[PDB]
Design a protein around this motif. Structure first.
Motif, PDB file in Angstrom:
ATOM      1  N   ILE D  47       0.783  -1.194   0.000  1.00  0.00           N
ATOM      2  CA  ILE D  47       0.000   0.000   0.000  1.00  0.00           C
ATOM      3  C   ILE D  47       0.826   1.261   0.000  1.00  0.00           C
ATOM      4  N   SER D  48       2.041   1.234   0.559  1.00  0.00           N
ATOM      5  CA  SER D  48       2.730   2.455   0.750  1.00  0.00           C
ATOM      6  C   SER D  48       4.166   2.462   0.229  1.00  0.00           C
TER       7      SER D  48
ATOM      8  N   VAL E  78      -1.989   5.826   2.223  1.00  0.00           N
ATOM      9  CA  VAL E  78      -1.398   5.617   0.902  1.00  0.00           C
ATOM     10  C   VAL E  78      -0.575   6.905   0.654  1.00  0.00           C
TER      11      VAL E  78
END
Lengths: 145, 145, 145, 145, 145, 145
Positions: D47-48, E78
Motif C-alpha cells: 500500500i505504501s 497511501v
C-alpha cells in the motif's frame, strides 16, 4: 452451519460407488455455471433461489437418503456459503440434519485448477445449439483426430 | 475516460481484418478469465495490475498503431471500467490519444449470452492435459465428426 | 442504523461486569478472524451471513436482554458497518429496538493497537495442534515461567 | 512476471538450510501484518512502498545472492501480486534477473491454514509489552508449564 | 523511513512555539487539500510531486534547521506514507537525516475528527474570491456576528 | 445501468424549484463526505450500504415521485457508479423505472472545481462545535464585516 471439504476429498466421494449415491453436489453459481461443472450437480443459484426452493431440496435430499451435500460456487467465498447457510436453516426448520452440509473449499476454480488437467472425466460443459452435456474426457477424445 | 461498445459492435470489429489489426481486446478478469475468452485478448487483471503496467500497455498499443482498445471483464461493472480508467489516466500522463478507450457493455457474460450459440467461432476455451486454445466452433466440429 | 463506540469505551463496558452481561461483541470478520479476538465475541462473517441468521441473532440477543451489540471487523470500514446495517434492519423487521447497535471505531486493529501491550487479558489467540483459546495475558505468564 | 508457488513448496525451501539462504520471503501486508508471519520475512507493504524502495530491495537481494523471492500477503490476491509486479519491473529497470519472482498461492491465510497446527516452528507472532517475536512452537512449549 | 505521530502529539507540537519552528507539516493531498488543512503546512501532492521536488524540500528544511517533518494526507494510508518514503529517500540520497520524518496517524480525517470542534484555531480553509485564508475559529466568530 | 449528468446540467436541475422536487442527489462518499456537499443530498456510503438499503431507497424515491436520482462521490469513478449499479439493480428487482438513474461526471471534485466560486450558494459545509450546515455564500457574507 457447514464445514469445508477439500477438492481431493470431494474427488474421493465422487470416485466411490456407494459414497456417490450418498452425495449431492449443489452448484450455487448463476451465469458462471457454464464455465464448467461436476456432472449430476444440482444448480441452486444463490442470487435467485428462494426460501421454498431450499426447503423443497432439503426434503428431496432427505428422501433420497443423501448423507453429504457439498455446496460450491466459483470461489466458495460468498455464494456457496450463503447457499449452504440457507439450506442448513431450511433443514433445521423442517427438522432434518441429513444430508450433512459442506462447502467445497476454493470452489469450482480451485477444483478445476487441481483436477482439470488430470481428471477430465469429472468435468462437464454444455456444448452446442441444444446445450448437450459432455465430459472434457469425451471432448478431448473427440478433438484427438 | 471511455465509452461503451455493444457486443454487436465488437463482433463487427472482430469480423473485419482492417478493423481487427486496429483493435485490441483487453480482458480484465483474474481467476474467472478461463471461463471462456476472445482469442488474442490481452490479460490485464485489474485486481493485480500496477501503474507502470498500464503505461507499458499504453506505449505498446500506440506504437502498434491500435485505434481501439476494448476492455471487458465478466460483467464490465467493476473490473473493466477500473481497467479503462487506469489505462485512460496512463494515456493522459504519457501524452497519447490513441487507441481510443472502450468498455464492452455487459462484459463477457453478455457477449457470450448474445453470441455463444450463433457465433461459436468467436468463443475460445482451453482444453486437455495441456490446456490448449480451441474455439467452441471446432469443438462442435470434433463432436459432430 | 448504528453509531460508533471507541476502543476506550468498549474496554469500559467489558471491565464493568454489569455492562458486560448487557453487551454482545459481534465479530464480522471471515478468513482473517483468527489474527486475534475478544473472548466470547460472536462471529457473524459479513461475507457469508444470510437474512435469517441476523433475524435469529436479533431474537437471541433480545431474549438474553442485551442492551448494546458492538460490531467490529478488522478496520470497521466495510464488514462491521455492513453487518450492523443488516442487523439493525433484521431488528426493525422483527420489531425490536434492543440491543442498540454500535460499530467499534477502527475495528480489532485499532483496539489491539491501543490495548495489546497494556491489556493483554482482553486479547485472545488460538494456538497449538488443537488451536485452543488462550488470552495474551496467559501467554505472557507462560513465557515468563 | 512471477509464477506461483504453493505452501508445500515454500516449506520444502524453508526446511532445507541451503534453499533457505538462497530464498527471501517478502511480506506485502500492512496493518494486518501482525496476524502472524514467517521469521525474517521482509516487510514491503504494497500500500505504501514506493518505486526506489523496490529498486533497493532488488539490488540488496541480488547482492545477497538470493535466487528466489517469494511475495505473500493475506490472500495473495491483491497485495502480493502487485508487490511482485512492482518488484519484477524494478529488477528489469536495474538489469537484474535474479532472484526469480514468486507469489505464494493463497498467502499467509492458506499457509497457516495448512501448517499452523503441524509446523508451528514456522509461525511467528509478536507478544508482550515489548511486542517481542516468538515462534508458536516456543509458545506451545511455554504453555506446557 | 518514518514513524507515526498521533493527532494529540501533533497539537502538542503546534502549541509549543519553540517546537513549532523546529517542525514542518507536509500535506500530501491533491484536490482534497481544500477540505481543510493546518496553517503553513506545505503541500507536496503525492500524485504529482517529482523526485527533484522532494530533494529540494530536503535541502530547504535542512537549511531552515527543521527537526521534524510530519506528513499527512486524508487517511494517511497511501499518499502520506508514500510521500514520507519518497522524502526520506531524497534526504538519504542527499546525505541528510534531519528533519526526522513522521506520518500523522489517521491523517487529516482523524485529526479533524478529534479536534475540529474543540480546536478550530488549528483548522484552515480558503474562502471566496480567488481565496483567503481563514481559521474556522475566525469563521465561527464572523458567523456568530 | 445509468447515464452521465455533467455538473452544468446538475446545476440546471438544482436551480429549478420545480425540478428540485423531481430530483434526488445521492452522496456516495464515506469519511471524505464532509469535505463539502449539496444541501439535502442523501448519504448512501457505497462502502457500507447493503442490498436492502438500496431497496428501501428505491421504494422511498418512487413514493416521493422523483424522476432523476443523481449519484456522485469524490470523483465518480469508483463509489458512485457502484452506488448507481446497485440502485438500478434494486429498481429492476422491485419493478420501478423511476427515478431514472444518473452519475454526476467527475463527482464532487469536478462540480466544486467548476462552481465553487461562481456558485457558492450550492456549496455546503458543516462548521463549529455543533458542525451546523451552512452554505459557502453565507460564510462569505458573514466574513463581510
Amino acid at each position: 452451519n457447514y464445514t469445508y471439504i477439500k477438492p481431493e476429498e470431494l474427488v474421493e466421494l465422487l470416485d466411490n460407488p456407494d459414497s456417490l449415491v450418498k452425495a449431492a453436489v449443489i452448484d450455487c453459481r448463476d451465469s458462471d455455471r457454464d464455465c464448467g461443472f461436476i456432472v449430476n450437480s444440482i444448480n441452486m443459484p444463490t442470487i435467485s433461489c428462494t426460501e421454498e426452493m431450499y426447503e423443497k431440496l432439503a426434503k428431496t435430499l432427505f428422501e433420497e437418503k443423501k448423507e453429504l451435500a457439498v455446496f460450491h460456487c466459483a470461489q466458495s467465498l460468498v455464494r456457496a456459503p450463503k447457499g449452504a447457510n440457507r439450506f442448513a436453516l431450511a433443514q433445521k426448520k423442517l427438522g432434518y440434519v441429513l444430508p450433512a452440509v459442506y462447502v467445497l473449499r476454493g470452489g469450482w476454480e480451485a477444483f478445476y485448477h487441481m483436477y482439470g488437467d488430470v481428471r477430465p472425466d469429472l468435468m462437464y460443459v454444455k456444448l452446442g445449439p441444444e446445450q448437450k452435456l459432455i465430459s472434457e474426457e469425451d471432448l478431448n477424445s473427440a478433438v484427438d483426430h
